[PDB]
Design a protein around this ligand. Structure first.
Ligand SMILES: [Mg+2]
Ligand SMILES: [Mg+2]
Ligand SMILES: [Mg+2]
Ligand SMILES: [Mg+2]
Ligand SMILES: [Mg+2]
Ligand SMILES: [Mg+2]
Ligand SMILES: [Mg+2]
Ligand SMILES: [Mg+2]
Ligand SMILES: [Mg+2]
Ligand SMILES: [Mg+2]
Ligand SMILES: [Mg+2]
Ligand SMILES: [Mg+2]
Ligand SMILES: [Mg+2]
Ligand SMILES: [Mg+2]
Ligand SMILES: [Mg+2]
Ligand SMILES: [Mg+2]
Ligand SMILES: [Mg+2]
Ligand SMILES: [Mg+2]
Ligand SMILES: [Mg+2]
Ligand SMILES: [Mg+2]
Ligand SMILES: [Mg+2]
Ligand SMILES: [Mg+2]
Ligand SMILES: [Mg+2]
Ligand SMILES: [Mg+2]
Ligand SMILES: [Mg+2]
Ligand SMILES: [Mg+2]
Ligand SMILES: [Mg+2]
Ligand SMILES: [Mg+2]
Ligand SMILES: [Mg+2]
Ligand SMILES: [Mg+2]
Ligand SMILES: [Mg+2]
Ligand SMILES: [Mg+2]
Ligand SMILES: [Mg+2]
Ligand SMILES: [Mg+2]
Ligand SMILES: [Mg+2]
Ligand SMILES: [Mg+2]
Ligand SMILES: [Mg+2]
Ligand SMILES: [Mg+2]
Ligand SMILES: [Mg+2]
Ligand SMILES: [Mg+2]
Ligand SMILES: [Mg+2]
Ligand SMILES: [Mg+2]
Ligand SMILES: [Mg+2]
Ligand SMILES: [Mg+2]
Ligand SMILES: [Mg+2]
Ligand SMILES: [Mg+2]
Ligand SMILES: [Mg+2]
Ligand SMILES: [Mg+2]
Ligand SMILES: [Mg+2]
Ligand SMILES: [Mg+2]
Ligand SMILES: [Mg+2]
Ligand SMILES: [Mg+2]
Ligand SMILES: [Mg+2]
Ligand SMILES: [Mg+2]
Ligand SMILES: [Mg+2]
Ligand SMILES: [Mg+2]
Ligand SMILES: [Mg+2]
Ligand SMILES: [Mg+2]
Ligand SMILES: [Mg+2]
Ligand SMILES: [Mg+2]
Ligand SMILES: [Mg+2]
Ligand SMILES: [Mg+2]
Ligand SMILES: [Mg+2]
Ligand SMILES: [Mg+2]
Ligand SMILES: [Mg+2]
Ligand SMILES: [Mg+2]
Ligand SMILES: [Mg+2]
Ligand SMILES: [Mg+2]
Ligand SMILES: [Mg+2]
Ligand SMILES: [Mg+2]
Ligand SMILES: [Mg+2]
Ligand SMILES: [Mg+2]
Ligand SMILES: [Mg+2]
Ligand SMILES: [Mg+2]
Ligand SMILES: [Mg+2]
Ligand SMILES: [Mg+2]
Ligand SMILES: [Mg+2]
Ligand SMILES: [Mg+2]
Ligand SMILES: [Mg+2]
Ligand SMILES: [Mg+2]
Ligand SMILES: [Mg+2]
Ligand SMILES: [Mg+2]
Ligand SMILES: [Mg+2]
Ligand SMILES: [Mg+2]
Ligand SMILES: [Mg+2]
Ligand SMILES: [Mg+2]
Ligand SMILES: [Mg+2]
Ligand SMILES: [Mg+2]
Ligand SMILES: [Mg+2]
Ligand SMILES: [Mg+2]
Ligand SMILES: [Mg+2]
Ligand SMILES: [Mg+2]
Ligand SMILES: [Mg+2]
Ligand SMILES: [Mg+2]
Ligand SMILES: [Mg+2]
Ligand SMILES: [Mg+2]
Ligand SMILES: [Mg+2]
Ligand SMILES: [Mg+2]
Ligand SMILES: [Mg+2]
Ligand SMILES: [Mg+2]
Ligand SMILES: [Mg+2]
Ligand SMILES: [Mg+2]
Ligand SMILES: [Mg+2]
Ligand SMILES: [Mg+2]
Ligand SMILES: [Mg+2]
Ligand SMILES: [Mg+2]
Ligand SMILES: [Mg+2]
Ligand SMILES: [Mg+2]
Ligand SMILES: [Mg+2]
Ligand SMILES: [Mg+2]
Ligand SMILES: [Mg+2]
Ligand SMILES: [Mg+2]
Ligand SMILES: [Mg+2]
Ligand SMILES: [Mg+2]
Ligand SMILES: [Mg+2]
Ligand SMILES: [Mg+2]
Ligand SMILES: [Mg+2]
Ligand SMILES: [Mg+2]
Ligand SMILES: [Mg+2]
Ligand SMILES: [Mg+2]
Ligand SMILES: [Mg+2]
Ligand SMILES: [Mg+2]
Ligand SMILES: [Mg+2]
Ligand SMILES: [Mg+2]
Ligand SMILES: [Mg+2]
Ligand SMILES: [Mg+2]
Ligand SMILES: [Mg+2]
Ligand SMILES: [Mg+2]
Ligand SMILES: [Mg+2]
Ligand SMILES: [Mg+2]
Ligand SMILES: [Mg+2]
Ligand SMILES: [Mg+2]
Ligand SMILES: [Mg+2]
Ligand SMILES: [Mg+2]
Ligand SMILES: [Mg+2]
Ligand SMILES: [Mg+2]
Ligand SMILES: [Mg+2]
Ligand SMILES: [Mg+2]
Ligand SMILES: [Mg+2]
Ligand SMILES: [Mg+2]
Ligand SMILES: [Mg+2]
Ligand SMILES: [Mg+2]
Ligand SMILES: [Mg+2]
Ligand SMILES: [Mg+2]
Ligand SMILES: [Mg+2]
Ligand SMILES: [Mg+2]
Ligand SMILES: [Mg+2]
Ligand SMILES: [Mg+2]
Ligand SMILES: [Mg+2]
Ligand SMILES: [Mg+2]
Ligand SMILES: [Mg+2]
Ligand SMILES: [Mg+2]
Ligand SMILES: [Mg+2]
Ligand SMILES: [Mg+2]
Ligand SMILES: [Mg+2]
Ligand SMILES: [Mg+2]
Ligand SMILES: [Mg+2]
Ligand SMILES: [Mg+2]
Ligand SMILES: [Mg+2]
Ligand SMILES: [Mg+2]
Ligand SMILES: [Mg+2]
Ligand SMILES: [Mg+2]
Ligand SMILES: [Zn+2]
Lengths: 112, 101, 14, 59, 154, 140, 116
RNA sequence: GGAUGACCCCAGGCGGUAGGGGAGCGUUCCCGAUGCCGAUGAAGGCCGACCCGCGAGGGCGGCUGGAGGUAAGGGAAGUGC
RNA sequence: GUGGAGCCUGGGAGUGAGGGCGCGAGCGAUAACGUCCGCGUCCGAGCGCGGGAACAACCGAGACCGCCAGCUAAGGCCCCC
RNA sequence: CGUGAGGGAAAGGUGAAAAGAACCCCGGGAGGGGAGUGAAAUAGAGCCUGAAACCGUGGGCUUACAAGCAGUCACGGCCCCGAGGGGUUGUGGCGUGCCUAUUGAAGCAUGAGCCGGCGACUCACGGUCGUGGGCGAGCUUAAGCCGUUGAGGCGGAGGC
């Protein structure tokens, strides 16, 4: 029995959020909460929301127990990039990519 | 008790009951053929100079085949020379029945 | 990019 | 200068090998003596405002 | 590349831009540009020798005779325009509709009866061709139309 | 049939007195034992030759004016750091290295050959510490 | 009628790439670099089919030489004796015998020593 | 050899750039087709250590897909990166 | 002397920047990885193979495919080999 | 976009039917998880199929004394599928990318970041050979005219 959440089209750079998701993979829900609370990273706010949402799904929809939840799987896929124009010298336009992440968190029940 | 036989221009050490693939022989399957003995060993020792006279290796023809396909590829640079060739060596599969002698 | 920055002049190899 | 430039594109193996030192180290945490909540050492607890055994600020 | 809607402007200078040299965007190297040797309207027809089509018409009719597949009818009895009239007739001739038939007759009423049968091509004698003869498994002609075929290969 | 390929054998230790032997003519024989090419089951892609213990390497012998004239070289990587040392000096300071250098230069380069060098144990003087391995003296 | 590329170039590219499985970086992912790798690979295969025959014979000769020295002679003495003895047992089998049947190799030395 | 590719035997040739010549494969389209394959699954996709072919390719099977496809034999080209 | 010999008529070419080597000369300085002719040869196109440490044209030798079989060529046989 | 004359794009497809997802849960929202619709929802509107480059998670094998156009040949080890086969690669052997241009390139000469799609020897009329047929001291019609409506015929002017 597993419970998942996906935050899609978060306007953040995948490479940046992954560092934050790497702190929590295979942690219990309590450890992942404490970790995320004191991580000095924008991406922690977005991860916390996906974590809690998946946990609510575990308790509410899938008959799982909040005390036995751990992050069985978690990964950040990249979504469509927002392309924007950056003006440079001598009249050139650079194209900035404001990248996008789909954030997934999957929780299992750690029996024992 | 083994024999060193010659078939297909190659030499093979064979004992009673040994399945072997040699070059393709011209015999229907099931039929039996005798192979030339260059050396008997194991219990006695008989050294042919080259072929032992009385000796003979009985072999039964299980079947004939085509080995897995070697790709024979040829390339020459700066000259647009390329050749692709699929090769499957025909073979014959023998079961060594008895070493006559 | 309808504007092309003109290339730098070559080092004079005379 | 004369505008140095990457001579070759960096392989997936070399790109990621450089990131071999890029993992976050998790935050240093200790439980608060009063309310038993995990919090970084040497800071006032943000869940009860207790430090050095006494209430220091409202939360 | 000259029938295409674009302008004949050089899109950027010949030299010193770091890009490939180009002319106008109608060159067939461009997406949306011209087509190099695409089709234009053509006249596929040609004057095949008269003797050759005269002979082929004669030969094609001969082929169906050499398999006993040609049938001359004096007239089409009770066939006055209705399909089921022509079917009824086709019965009493061994034309049960398991073989493709070329019906060749000047009788406007009879052609109209048979035009809709899927196994019947219909034809006036003036239009006896070898494609339609070969297209079909057996042939059926007016003795009036057999006279017309005997003229056209004389 | 396939060509036999040997299962891993336990190796055999040997022992050589290098007194009055000729440096290069002994090195080829040591090189061969280390390659195992004296064994009918020799296999090129595995380390299966002999462990070779040499003694009295201080008393290796050499013909001609090689003591004065043979020069060993070492380059440190620094400007000017080509060091030249003559055999005389090497036998006076690190005599185990004269043989060591000659056999090493006669082994194959690459991983396997580098392992084979580790199986050679040259000492100066008549004594060696490998009595636990109970080595078998040779006559070369 | 227009005949657009369609499915052909892709199926052709997959044939190559499937042959390139196991290659390094783009040499297994990029159709172009895969094909270049396969030019070199196909010539190496041809070349090493030739070299295999010489590799193994050269191994066989080494193993034969070693078994010969145990009985007192070197390889070149032994081969000559078998020629003069008329023995035609090839090097693939002299090697198997040298290692699996040292009593049969033993007599093979004696027939060679005695044939000079 | 048998009697004009109907297969077999023996012998010889078979490195190749510019280039000449021969025979094939595959793509789109037409006739064949008022046919035939098709929701008991079309084309396309993804696998395959299997079958045929010297090869280009062709099958066959499993997953995907969900409405087309198209034979033997010929015909014509916007035909293979 | 029956040879991927030769002759005749006709269709289609490409080439018209050659290079190294041996020998004969000229030019050069009895210099050049020089230059220009002649005879021959290889590379070109045999940057396929063995030898020459490595290396188009030096020596050996003309790769249709397969073999964990045998004989040799140049060159080699103390160890790397 | 250009003062202007003028230049000049990209962008099609849910499903048979909106039945276009009530209501509940996390969430500021976006998004998601259930429920429900549907034959099908990785057909959910960022919608048919959904390739490749590219990015990621998980698993098997592997690697921190090793010299490399990245392969290939051999053997061994481990994992998988059931006298065999597939994956991986430790050691040993051998090994100078592709294309272009050149007398000669791995070449430190040219082009190419990578992938997908577009992308270059054709048509007309005349000629000259060759070739499959028809007719043969003859062969052949053009434009038109008639007929058909994917039917063919007539037309001898003219040409060779
Ligand atoms: Mg931190
Ligand atoms: Mg909760
Ligand atoms: Mg600026
Ligand atoms: Mg700026
Ligand atoms: Mg850019
Ligand atoms: Mg960008
Ligand atoms: Mg992005
Ligand atoms: Mg075989
Ligand atoms: Mg090959
Ligand atoms: Mg090749
Ligand atoms: Mg070549
Ligand atoms: Mg190349
Ligand atoms: Mg090359
Ligand atoms: Mg060339
Ligand atoms: Mg080429
Ligand atoms: Mg080329
Ligand atoms: Mg090429
Ligand atoms: Mg081939
Ligand atoms: Mg530009
Ligand atoms: Mg510039
Ligand atoms: Mg500066
Ligand atoms: Mg500067
Ligand atoms: Mg400055
Ligand atoms: Mg600086
Ligand atoms: Mg700069
Ligand atoms: Mg990676
Ligand atoms: Mg790096
Ligand atoms: Mg960094
Ligand atoms: Mg890290
Ligand atoms: Mg504490
Ligand atoms: Mg144009
Ligand atoms: Mg125009
Ligand atoms: Mg225009
Ligand atoms: Mg316009
Ligand atoms: Mg316009
Ligand atoms: Mg214009
Ligand atoms: Mg213009
Ligand atoms: Mg230019
Ligand atoms: Mg330019
Ligand atoms: Mg550039
Ligand atoms: Mg460009
Ligand atoms: Mg550019
Ligand atoms: Mg331009
Ligand atoms: Mg252009
Ligand atoms: Mg242009
Ligand atoms: Mg122009
Ligand atoms: Mg257009
Ligand atoms: Mg357009
Ligand atoms: Mg054109
Ligand atoms: Mg025409
Ligand atoms: Mg009808
Ligand atoms: Mg009809
Ligand atoms: Mg019909
Ligand atoms: Mg000695
Ligand atoms: Mg070894
Ligand atoms: Mg001296
Ligand atoms: Mg195309
Ligand atoms: Mg691999
Ligand atoms: Mg590999
Ligand atoms: Mg890769
Ligand atoms: Mg990589
Ligand atoms: Mg691949
Ligand atoms: Mg790969
Ligand atoms: Mg890839
Ligand atoms: Mg080979
Ligand atoms: Mg050989
Ligand atoms: Mg040996
Ligand atoms: Mg001999
Ligand atoms: Mg012999
Ligand atoms: Mg044994
Ligand atoms: Mg021939
Ligand atoms: Mg050829
Ligand atoms: Mg075709
Ligand atoms: Mg179409
Ligand atoms: Mg037709
Ligand atoms: Mg139809
Ligand atoms: Mg049906
Ligand atoms: Mg159905
Ligand atoms: Mg199905
Ligand atoms: Mg198709
Ligand atoms: Mg189609
Ligand atoms: Mg297929
Ligand atoms: Mg399918
Ligand atoms: Mg339809
Ligand atoms: Mg069709
Ligand atoms: Mg066809
Ligand atoms: Mg057309
Ligand atoms: Mg085209
Ligand atoms: Mg010839
Ligand atoms: Mg000729
Ligand atoms: Mg031609
Ligand atoms: Mg021609
Ligand atoms: Mg020319
Ligand atoms: Mg000229
Ligand atoms: Mg000239
Ligand atoms: Mg000249
Ligand atoms: Mg000349
Ligand atoms: Mg010159
Ligand atoms: Mg010369
Ligand atoms: Mg001379
Ligand atoms: Mg002269
Ligand atoms: Mg030279
Ligand atoms: Mg000279
Ligand atoms: Mg000269
Ligand atoms: Mg010459
Ligand atoms: Mg050339
Ligand atoms: Mg040569
Ligand atoms: Mg030649
Ligand atoms: Mg070469
Ligand atoms: Mg070279
Ligand atoms: Mg050479
Ligand atoms: Mg060489
Ligand atoms: Mg050379
Ligand atoms: Mg050469
Ligand atoms: Mg040849
Ligand atoms: Mg020999
Ligand atoms: Mg010799
Ligand atoms: Mg040796
Ligand atoms: Mg403006
Ligand atoms: Mg304006
Ligand atoms: Mg729709
Ligand atoms: Mg619709
Ligand atoms: Mg439907
Ligand atoms: Mg609607
Ligand atoms: Mg709420
Ligand atoms: Mg929502
Ligand atoms: Mg959720
Ligand atoms: Mg929802
Ligand atoms: Mg169904
Ligand atoms: Mg799907
Ligand atoms: Mg679907
Ligand atoms: Mg649909
Ligand atoms: Mg889709
Ligand atoms: Mg998608
Ligand atoms: Mg996908
Ligand atoms: Mg991974
Ligand atoms: Mg070391
Ligand atoms: Mg290690
Ligand atoms: Mg290398
Ligand atoms: Mg081996
Ligand atoms: Mg296995
Ligand atoms: Mg393996
Ligand atoms: Mg290796
Ligand atoms: Mg290429
Ligand atoms: Mg050039
Ligand atoms: Mg040049
Ligand atoms: Mg290079
Ligand atoms: Mg380059
Ligand atoms: Mg380079
Ligand atoms: Mg340059
Ligand atoms: Mg140039
Ligand atoms: Mg180029
Ligand atoms: Mg670029
Ligand atoms: Mg790439
Ligand atoms: Mg492409
Ligand atoms: Mg043409
Ligand atoms: Mg055209
Ligand atoms: Mg013509
Ligand atoms: Mg003609
Ligand atoms: Mg005619
Ligand atoms: Mg005639
Ligand atoms: Mg006429
Ligand atoms: Zn507290």
């Amino acid at each position: 029995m597993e419970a998942k959440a996906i935050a899609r089209y978060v306007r953040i750079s995948p490479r940046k959020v992954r560092l934050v998701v790497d702190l929590i993979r295979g942690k219990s829900l309590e450890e992942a909460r404490n970790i995320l609370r004191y991580t000095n990273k924008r991406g922690a706010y977005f991860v916390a929301k996906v974590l809690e949402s998946a946990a609510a799904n575990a308790v509410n929809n899938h008959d799982m127990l909040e005390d036995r939840l751990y992050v069985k799987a978690a990964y950040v896929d990249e979504g469509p990039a927002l392309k924007r124009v950056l003006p440079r010298a001598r009249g050139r336009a650079d194209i900035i990519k404001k990248r996008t992440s789909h954030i997934t968190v999957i929780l299992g029940e750690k029996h024992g | 008790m083994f024999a060193i036989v010659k078939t297909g221009g190659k030499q093979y050490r064979v004992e009673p009951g040994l399945k072997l693939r040699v070059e393709k022989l011209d015999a229907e399957p099931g039929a039996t053929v005798e192979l030339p003995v260059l050396l008997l060993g194991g219990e006695k020792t008989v050294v042919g100079t080259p072929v032992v006279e009385g000796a003979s290796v009985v072999a039964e023809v299980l079947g004939h085949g085509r080995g897995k396909k070697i790709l024979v590829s040829k390339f020459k640079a700066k000259v647009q020379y390329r050749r692709k060739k699929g090769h499957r060596q025909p073979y014959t599969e023998l079961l060594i029945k008895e070493i006559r002698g | 990019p309808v504007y092309i920055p003109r290339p730098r002049p070559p080092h004079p190899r005379l | 200068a004369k505008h140095p430039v990457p001579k070759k594109k960096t392989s997936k193996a070399r790109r990621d090998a450089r990131r071999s030192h890029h993992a976050l180290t998790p935050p240093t945490l200790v439980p608060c003596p009063e309310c038993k909540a995990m919090k970084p050492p040497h800071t006032v607890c943000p869940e009860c405002g207790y430090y050095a055994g006494r209430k220091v600020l409202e939360v | 590349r000259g029938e295409v809607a674009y302008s004949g402007r050089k899109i950027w200078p010949q030299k010193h831009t770091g890009r490939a040299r180009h002319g106008d965007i109608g060159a067939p190297i461009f997406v949306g540009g011209g087509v190099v040797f695409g089709p234009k309207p053509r006249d596929y027809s040609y004057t095949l020798p008269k003797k050759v089509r005269k002979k082929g018409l004669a030969m094609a009719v001969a082929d169906r005779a050499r398999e006993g597949k040609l049938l001359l009818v004096e007239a089409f009895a009770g066939v006055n325009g209705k399909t089921k009239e022509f079917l009824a007739w086709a019965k009493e001739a061994g034309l049960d509709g398991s073989e493709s038939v070329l019906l060749v007759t000047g009788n406007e009423l009879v052609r109209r009866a048979a035009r809709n049968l899927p196994w019947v091509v219909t034809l006036a004698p003036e239009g006896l061709n070898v494609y339609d003869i070969v297209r079909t498994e057996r042939l059926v002609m007016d003795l009036d139309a057999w006279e017309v075929f005997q003229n056209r290969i004389g | 049939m396939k060509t036999y390929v040997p299962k891993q054998v336990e190796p055999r230790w040997v022992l050589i007195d290098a007194e009055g032997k000729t440096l290069g003519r002994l090195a080829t024989k040591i090189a061969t034992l280390l390659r195992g090419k004296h064994r009918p089951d020799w296999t090129p892609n595995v380390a299966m030759g002999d462990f070779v213990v040499v003694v009295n390497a201080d008393k290796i012998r050499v013909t001609g004016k090689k003591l004065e004239q043979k020069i060993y070289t070492r380059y440190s990587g620094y400007p000017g750091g080509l060091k030249k040392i003559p055999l005389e000096k090497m036998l006076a300071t690190h005599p185990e290295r004269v043989l060591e250098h000659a056999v090493k230069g006669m082994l194959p380069k690459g991983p396997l050959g580098r392992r084979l060098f580790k199986r050679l144990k040259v000492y100066a003087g008549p004594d060696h510490p490998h009595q636990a391995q109970r080595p078998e003296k040779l006559e070369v | 009628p227009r005949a657009k590329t369609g499915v052909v170039r892709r199926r052709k590219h997959k044939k190559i790439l499937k042959l390139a499985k196991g290659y390094w970086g783009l040499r297994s992912k990029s159709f172009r670099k895969a094909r270049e790798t396969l030019f070199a690979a196909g010539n190496y295969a041809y070349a090493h089919r030739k070299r295999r025959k010489r590799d193994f014979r050269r191994l066989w000769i080494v193993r034969i030489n070693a078994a010969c020295r145990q009985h007192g002679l070197n390889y070149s003495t032994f081969i000559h004796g078998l020629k003069k003895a008329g023995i035609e047992v090839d090097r693939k089998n002299l090697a198997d015998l040298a290692v699996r049947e040292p009593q049969v190799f033993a007599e093979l030395v004696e027939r060679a020593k005695a044939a000079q």
